Amino acid sequence: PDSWDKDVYPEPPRRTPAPAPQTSLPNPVTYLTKIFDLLVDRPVTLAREFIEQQHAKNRYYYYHREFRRVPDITECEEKDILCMFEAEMQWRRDYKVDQEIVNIIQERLKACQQREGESYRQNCAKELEQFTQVSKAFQDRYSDLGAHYSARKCLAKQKQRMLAERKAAKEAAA
Amino acid sequence: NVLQIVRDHWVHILVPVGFVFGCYLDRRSDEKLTAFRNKSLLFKRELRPNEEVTWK
Amino acid sequence: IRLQEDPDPEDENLYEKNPDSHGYDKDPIVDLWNMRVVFFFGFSIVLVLGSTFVAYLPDYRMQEWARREAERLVKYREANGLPLMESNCFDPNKIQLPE
Amino acid sequence: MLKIIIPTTMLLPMTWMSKHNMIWINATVHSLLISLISLSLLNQLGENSLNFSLTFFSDSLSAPLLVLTTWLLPLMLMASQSHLSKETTTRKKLYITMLILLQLFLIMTFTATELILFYILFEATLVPTLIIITRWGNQTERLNAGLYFLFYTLAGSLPLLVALVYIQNTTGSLNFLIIHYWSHPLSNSWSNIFMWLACIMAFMVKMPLYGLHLWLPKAHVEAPIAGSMVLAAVLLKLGGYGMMRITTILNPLTNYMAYPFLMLSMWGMIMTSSICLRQTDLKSLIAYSSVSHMALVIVAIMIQTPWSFMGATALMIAHGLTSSMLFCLANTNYERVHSRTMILARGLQTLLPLMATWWLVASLTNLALPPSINLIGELFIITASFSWSNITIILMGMNMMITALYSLYMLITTQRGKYTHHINNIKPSFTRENALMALHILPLLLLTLNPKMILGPLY
Amino acid sequence: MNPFASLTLTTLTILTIPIMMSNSNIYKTNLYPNYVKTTVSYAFTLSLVPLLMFMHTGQEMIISNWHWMTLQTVELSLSFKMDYFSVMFIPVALFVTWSIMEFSMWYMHSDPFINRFFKYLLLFLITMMILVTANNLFQLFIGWEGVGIMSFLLIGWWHGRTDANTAALQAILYNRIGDIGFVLSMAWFLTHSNAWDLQQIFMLNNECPNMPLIGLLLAAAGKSAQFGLHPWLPSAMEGPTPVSALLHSSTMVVAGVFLLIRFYPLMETNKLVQTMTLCLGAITTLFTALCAITQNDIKKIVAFSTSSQLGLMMVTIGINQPHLAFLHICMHAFFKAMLFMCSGSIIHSLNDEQDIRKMGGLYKAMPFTTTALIIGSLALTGMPYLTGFYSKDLIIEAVNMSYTNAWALLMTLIATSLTAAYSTRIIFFAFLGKPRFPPLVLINENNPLLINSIKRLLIGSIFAGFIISNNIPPMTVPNTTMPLYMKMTALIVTIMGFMLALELNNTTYYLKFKYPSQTYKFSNMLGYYPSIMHRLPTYHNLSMSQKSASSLLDLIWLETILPKTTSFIQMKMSIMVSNQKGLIKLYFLSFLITIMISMTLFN
Numbered sequence A: 001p002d003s004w005d006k007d008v009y010p011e012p013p014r015r016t017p018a019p020a021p022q023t024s025l026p027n028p029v030t031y032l033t034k035i036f037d038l039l040v041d042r043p044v045t046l047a048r049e050f051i052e053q054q055h056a057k058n059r060y061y062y063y064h065r066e067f068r069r070v071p072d073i074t075e076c077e078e079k080d081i082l083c084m085f086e087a088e089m090q091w092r093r094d095y096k097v098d099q100e101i102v103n104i105i106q107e108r109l110k111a112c113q114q115r116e117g118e119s120y121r122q123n124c125a126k127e128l129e130q131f132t133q134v135s136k137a138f139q140d141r142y143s144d145l146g147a148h149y150s151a152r153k154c155l156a157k158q159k160q161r162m163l164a165e166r167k168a169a170k171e172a173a174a
Numbered sequence B: 001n002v003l004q005i006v007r008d009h010w011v012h013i014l015v016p017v018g019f020v021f022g023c024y025l026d027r028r029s030d031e032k033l034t035a036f037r038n039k040s041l042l043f044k045r046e047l048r049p050n051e052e053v054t055w056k
Numbered sequence C: 001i002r003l004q005e006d007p008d009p010e011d012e013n014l015y016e017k018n019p020d021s022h023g024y025d026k027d028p029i030v031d032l033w034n035m036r037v038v039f040f041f042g043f044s045i046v047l048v049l050g051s052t053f054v055a056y057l058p059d060y061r062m063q064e065w066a067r068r069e070a071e072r073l074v075k076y077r078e079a080n081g082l083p084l085m086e087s088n089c090f091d092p093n094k095i096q097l098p099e
Numbered sequence D: 001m002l003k004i005i006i007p008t009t010m011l012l013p014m015t016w017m018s019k020h021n022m023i024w025i026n027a028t029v030h031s032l033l034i035s036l037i038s039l040s041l042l043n044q045l046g047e048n049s050l051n052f053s054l055t056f057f058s059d060s061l062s063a064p065l066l067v068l069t070t071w072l073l074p075l076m077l078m079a080s081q082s083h084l085s086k087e088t089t090t091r092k093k094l095y096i097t098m099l100i101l102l103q104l105f106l107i108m109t110f111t112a113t114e115l116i117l118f119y120i121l122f123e124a125t126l127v128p129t130l131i132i133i134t135r136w137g138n139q140t141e142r143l144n145a146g147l148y149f150l151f152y153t154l155a156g157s158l159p160l161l162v163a164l165v166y167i168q169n170t171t172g173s174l175n176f177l178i179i180h181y182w183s184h185p186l187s188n189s190w191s192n193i194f195m196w197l198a199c200i201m202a203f204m205v206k207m208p209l210y211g212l213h214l215w216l217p218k219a220h221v222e223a224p225i226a227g228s229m230v231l232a233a234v235l236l237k238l239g240g241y242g243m244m245r246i247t248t249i250l251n252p253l254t255n256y257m258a259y260p261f262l263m264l265s266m267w268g269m270i271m272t273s274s275i276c277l278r279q280t281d282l283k284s285l286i287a288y289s290s291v292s293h294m295a296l297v298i299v300a301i302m303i304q305t306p307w308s309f310m311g312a313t314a315l316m317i318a319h320g321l322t323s324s325m326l327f328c329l330a331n332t333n334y335e336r337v338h339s340r341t342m343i344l345a346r347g348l349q350t351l352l353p354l355m356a357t358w359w360l361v362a363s364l365t366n367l368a369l370p371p372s373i374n375l376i377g378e379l380f381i382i383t384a385s386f387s388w389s390n391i392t393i394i395l396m397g398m399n400m401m402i403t404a405l406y407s408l409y410m411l412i413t414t415q416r417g418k419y420t421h422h423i424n425n426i427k428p429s430f431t432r433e434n435a436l437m438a439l440h441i442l443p444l445l446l447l448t449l450n451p452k453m454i455l456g457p458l459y
Numbered sequence E: 001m002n003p004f005a006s007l008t009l010t011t012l013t014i015l016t017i018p019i020m021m022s023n024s025n026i027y028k029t030n031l032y033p034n035y036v037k038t039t040v041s042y043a044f045t046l047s048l049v050p051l052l053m054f055m056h057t058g059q060e061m062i063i064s065n066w067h068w069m070t071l072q073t074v075e076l077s078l079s080f081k082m083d084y085f086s087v088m089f090i091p092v093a094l095f096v097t098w099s100i101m102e103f104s105m106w107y108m109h110s111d112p113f114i115n116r117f118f119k120y121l122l123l124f125l126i127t128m129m130i131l132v133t134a135n136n137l138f139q140l141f142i143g144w145e146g147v148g149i150m151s152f153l154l155i156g157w158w159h160g161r162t163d164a165n166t167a168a169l170q171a172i173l174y175n176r177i178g179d180i181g182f183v184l185s186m187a188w189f190l191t192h193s194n195a196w197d198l199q200q201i202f203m204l205n206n207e208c209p210n211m212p213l214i215g216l217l218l219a220a221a222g223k224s225a226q227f228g229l230h231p232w233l234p235s236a237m238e239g240p241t242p243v244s245a246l247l248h249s250s251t252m253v254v255a256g257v258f259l260l261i262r263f264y265p266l267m268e269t270n271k272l273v274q275t276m277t278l279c280l281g282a283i284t285t286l287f288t289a290l291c292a293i294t295q296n297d298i299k300k301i302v303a304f305s306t307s308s309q310l311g312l313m314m315v316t317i318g319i320n321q322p323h324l325a326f327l328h329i330c331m332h333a334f335f336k337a338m339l340f341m342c343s344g345s346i347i348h349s350l351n352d353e354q355d356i357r358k359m360g361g362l363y364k365a366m367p368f369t370t371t372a373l374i375i376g377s378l379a380l381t382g383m384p385y386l387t388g389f390y391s392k393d394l395i396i397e398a399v400n401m402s403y404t405n406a407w408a409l410l411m412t413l414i415a416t417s418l419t420a421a422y423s424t425r426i427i428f429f430a431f432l433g434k435p436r437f438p439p440l441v442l443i444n445e446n447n448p449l450l451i452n453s454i455k456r457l458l459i460g461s462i463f464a465g466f467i468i469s470n471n472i473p474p475m476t477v478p479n480t481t482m483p484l485y486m487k488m489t490a491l492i493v494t495i496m497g498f499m500l501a502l503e504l505n506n507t508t509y510y511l512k513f514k515y516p517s518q519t520y521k522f523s524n525m526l527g528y529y530p531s532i533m534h535r536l537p538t539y540h541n542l543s544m545s546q547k548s549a550s551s552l553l554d555l556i557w558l559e560t561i562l563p564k565t566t567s568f569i570q571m572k573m574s575i576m577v578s579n580q581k582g583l584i585k586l587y588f589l590s591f592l593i594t595i596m597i598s599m600t601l602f603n
């Protein structure tokens, strides 16, 4: 369906086997499917067609709000309240977007497990690696900030991580 | 009579008029903080041809 | 006795004078209208209207906006081979570490 | 916030100018209208708060508490009109005035943007509550209860005043926004330890913390019904709101200073549940249940994780509603038989069926029954505490078991069994009482339906 | 769209529909029980259709229709998992509930609150369906606690009965211990996997650890009344017979087994938890059968048989055979519901007499209940081609053929023998011999409702096992090769139990009287577990709740330390300060001392 993006929400092509009956007995599943299509599918389709015809007469639109980039806390001077406010708001919006990215990856993982069914341990290894990488990055970003998290705390954590990496690299090179 | 209705039920407008006065005072307090109106980096924009302020 | 004190009064029952009493007031008319205003305003107005108002409050928490932004970022990043999540929130070039 | 503050200051003259028989009708109608108006604060932003002016602001944590207070006022009006039939007109108007002043102070306390104005207002809430208790209480112990309540709160809160003025002199501002953006780490020194102690101990006494709680049974048992409702529903939430506000400037010292309070909260939760198991008084049982739930909230705030704050807020709202409903039910039972002993009246299920249904619903919500917001908050707090350490799960499980035990013990003792033979003054339940219970219980289920409105800013 | 999801959700919704109509004139009239029964029948057929859909092509789905809330990176949504377990258990539960509801229309005719009884039964059914079809841990917990509270409300149906109230509270307590375990598992899963749904839990937990699996095991034991937490189920027989037939034995006590089945990948990954489950199931089935073989209350005997079957299911899960456990769940539901209905018919015919010592002659007094009970007992003991054969026989074969605990295997075999023994005891003391009931014979089992309900549950006890076994796909490797004696072990032990119990029952006709043995006293009093474990811990807890917490701490020492000592000190200082005689000489000498001190000590 065109409601979502197939790249963002992939689905492998669906291979449905063709029916190959081997008995003369009638198929109750087929008979009940035909009855269901006759009694339910056609009325709901007619109702939806009427509703969608009504909708097309009053077609109006809504837009996606766009936010421009602003200087971040690394550029903000010390105790410059306006720049700090702008940077904190931008950081919070980026945090929300990252949370939604993690949610998308988790939805991919769940859908792939359910789809593969009995062979999930092997066929879902591709989506498990992406989730592992995304979770690692998200944890390194916002792992232990606390309830009163802020862009300053995230920046201090990043500085600590960078200093630790530099120390490890220097020790290795020594 | 009709006078007794107003004589007894005139207290029923005090809360609505207080609500109206509170909305007016909220507008008055809002109009005193228009120092960064259409000046923030995030929401800065050119004014529309037939508008004076972005918000009131 | 040590005082000139009134005896403890008997408990008064509202159903005795008014069998169809709502328990708000001794006066039947005021009792009925108190019940009516309480029921109408509270239940109907507050419950129904406030519940539908809260249900249809605009999405000011930016949940759907965040979902759309995340979809765009995921599409762009996985299309170009970039990691889905950058390991750093800020730019190491813009961060100056002490010597 | 003036659009909500001014209607209360207009509630006052309306009550004082209304007729002798229309005071309750006018107060109830206009309180409900004010609550409906205040419902509009639930539309919050995901980034920052709603900054109305330099003095007042609203947040995702302040909005549910304001809505709860505005919704709670008419219920207190109904219960008060129940128990004040024979009072004089001037004294009825004084009681309504005390309730209105308490609501106004609570609204301003929740919306205040500075810590000093917050302190002034949250200390101003003492006077109406003390007057209500010590003036319209029924028994002799109301005077002692008022003294205990007043002096516990003040002895807790005066060092908070000293610490607040010291912090303002040191940093330049007590504005919450400024102290949030300009926060600096609190080093490990004796002076910092004592400042942390001053602030936290004030709000802990307000919570209350286990070992600093006797005022709560004393006041809640001896207060009138309106005082009991406001004290448990809202006045206990001032401590939690304050602790969630002030902990911005207390890091990282909170990591080291939270151990005694966490141990006190957990063990006292267990102990107060056990006390509930052996209570001969219904109001005391409800009071100690309140203490246990607030101890859980204290644990959540002290562990201080984003999952704990949401659980803390949800549990505060749920506990307010549930405790108010339980106090109302106990008050109806008391007005029937003029005694608070639990075993005095039995068979109330075969004597009053709809009240038995209300009791069942209230007791089911009191214990964590899914998908109620009580369970949502408790489960979030339990998950955060599990991430903190893996024996907190043992303590929380013990508490849940004892909570279910005492809730169902209260329900069975009051409602089930055979009726007392000599009690023949149990008239049918009033439409007023049934409407009170319905207006207590329906908002809780609607909040269960829509749970993101009471999970606070961390959502 | 595939009719699968539509039909499953429609079955759930039409189950929920009559609850909405409980505030109407139909609820105020006497047509409400028939209305509820008709709704359950229609739901049963509408759920039979998706079973046909699954048995053709093995179609399974998950439906995340409603999104509840997003806790940052965790999304909680109302999702339903319609897989083999759900689509096989729903029609069986609906069928059993339909039969029980007709039986209750007959049985509860004199109850003034029969409409409320039917509403409570429907609510329990809805909560059980939620538990079964739940896809995430939060929804599973919702169904868990819902069935728990419905059990609490239905056990104490007669509010004037102190024993009913105690039984309800006891069931709540044990289920709350189970809920402690459940919450532990949920907290661990969320903390270590950032998810509460089975798909992500299975994806991330490649090696599930002891803490979450033991939490799940504790929850399952609490809900399914395993050893240690068993006594609530036999005590739950205080409620009406329809409650015992539907809620406990047939559908609710298998909730823990179902929960353990739903996490069978993790159970396979771990081994210590499997050993613990096997041992717990073995001890449960042995102990409950041993208590059962010497009970005189027919409802108690059937309750202990249910507990023994639950222990057998737990053993089946422990030997890594999750699907055999589900098959046995279905078969046990069928024949145990039928047995409880027959026992209720016997009880109602003899004017609320529940003692086999007062029953007798019912073989010819009541033909249809006699044949139904005989068929049910044959199915329960594992008659070679009845409904219980296709599950119990395979379970015993898999236990004998696996790398298990030798003591657990021995206890399983002894439990099977004792199962045969107590079935023989029920038959012998209820139907064989001369009458022992009061002379006024009110025996009458000619009611169409009772006859039709027992007929429907009687066909299932014969043919349903064959159909279900021959329709489900192969989900485990069969034990084709095994020694002949091991192949015939179940029949041998069953026949030995039959013979020994029959001889011991025939020895009762002799004019010989002997005092009971210590073993008999131990087995008859339930192993002394309810006495000691219901008097000692409760007494100690309630004594410490008052002597220590309330009196010693709250009313004495917390008062003494902070508020009382301060008041005492202030009063003493006030008396000292204000105790002045008003003598100018005295306080002017005080002024002189103050002047000297100020002059000297201040510079």
Ligand SMILES: CCCCCCCCCCCCCCCCCC(=O)OC[C@H](COP(=O)([O-])OCC(O)COP(=O)([O-])OC[C@@H](COC(=O)CCCCCCCCCCCCCCCCC)OC(=O)CCCCCCCCCCCCCCCCC)OC(=O)CCCCCCCCCCCCCCCCC
Pocket: E290, E293, E294, E410, E413, E414, E417, E418, E421, E425, E493, E496, E497, E500, E501, E504, E515, E516, E517, E518, E519, E520, E521, E523
């Ligand atoms: C700390 C210990 C922990 C132990 C943990 C493990 C426990 C394992 C338990 C095993 C099963 C025990 C069953 C009997 C206990 C309950 C007795 C009772 O209350 O009966 C009254 C009760 C009648 O109640 P009532 O109608 O009120 O009548 C009042 C009584 O007459 C009133 O008369 P009464 O009071 O005189 O009646 C009781 C009396 C009479 O009952 C009997 O004689 C029952 C005998 C049952 C059969 C046992 C032998 C089986 C032989 C199988 C041979 C073939 C093996 C396979 C290989 C074949 C090919 C080579 O029994 C006794 O005196 C002892 C019987 C054996 C006790 C075993 C447990 C020992 C505990 C510790 C030692 C205590 C010793 C001193 C006793 C106390 C002081 C005096 O009996 C029944 O309802 C029938 C009982 C069941 C009979 C069939 C059992 C078949 C299954 C078990 C045998 C194994 C078969 C093969 C399995 C698969 C192997 C691979």
Ligand SMILES: CCCCCCCC/C=C/CCCCCCCC(=O)OC[C@H](COP(=O)(O)OCCN)OC(=O)CCCCCCC/C=C/CCCCCCCC
Pocket: D277, D397, D398, D401, D405, E163, E166, E167, E169, E170, E171, E173, E177, E180, E217, E218, E221, E227, E228, E229, E235, E280, E530, E531, E533, E534, E537, E538, E541, E542
């Ligand atoms: C996780 C921590 C908790 C662990 C267990 C702690 C047990 C604490 C005991 C609970 C305190 C009791 C407070 C009051 C309870 C309600 C009042 C009461 O006692 O009623 C007694 C009531 C009625 O008595 P009857 O036997 O029916 O006789 C009726 C005769 N006319 O009986 C009860 O409900 C008592 C049940 C308490 C159970 C105590 C022991 C529980 C077993 C725990 C150990 C088992 C561990 C499980 C192992 C699982 C392996 C995976």
